[PDB]
């Protein structure tokens, strides 16, 4: 029911920032019952909740609803929302590889 995908996002510079062109929800500090994208409503994982049309994530193949398992090898299955955000937005990293699962 879930298929593994590997995407390689090349961030886009927007002013001082490097951006990925998507949004995330979830995390072990959040209420998993409110995540509309998961199969199991106790799943506290990080999910892609929106993708910017024409942005880096879209070009790389990311899709709304994808569950993020790893970012550049870092486990994303049991992290807080803020930890996930920080891992995805390291200013020093222009390329981020995401391991995701897709229903």
């Amino acid at each position: 029911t879930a298929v593994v995908q590997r995407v390689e996002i090349h961030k886009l510079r927007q002013g001082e920032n490097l951006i990925l062109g998507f949004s995330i929800g979830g995390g072990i500090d959040q209420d998993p019952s409110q995540n509309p994208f998961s199969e199991d409503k106790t799943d506290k994982g990080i999910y892609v909740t929106r993708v910017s049309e024409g942005g880096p994530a879209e070009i790389a193949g990311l899709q709304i609803g994808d569950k993020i398992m790893q970012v550049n090898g870092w486990d994303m299955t049991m992290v807080t929302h803020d930890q996930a955000r920080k891992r995805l937005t390291k200013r020093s990293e222009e390329v981020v590889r995401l391991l995701v699962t897709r229903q």
Partner: peptide, 9 residues
């Protein structure tokens, strides 16, 4: 959803 915060990155 107010109870499903999301972050833009």
């Amino acid at each position: 959803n107010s109870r499903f915060p999301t972050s833009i990155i």
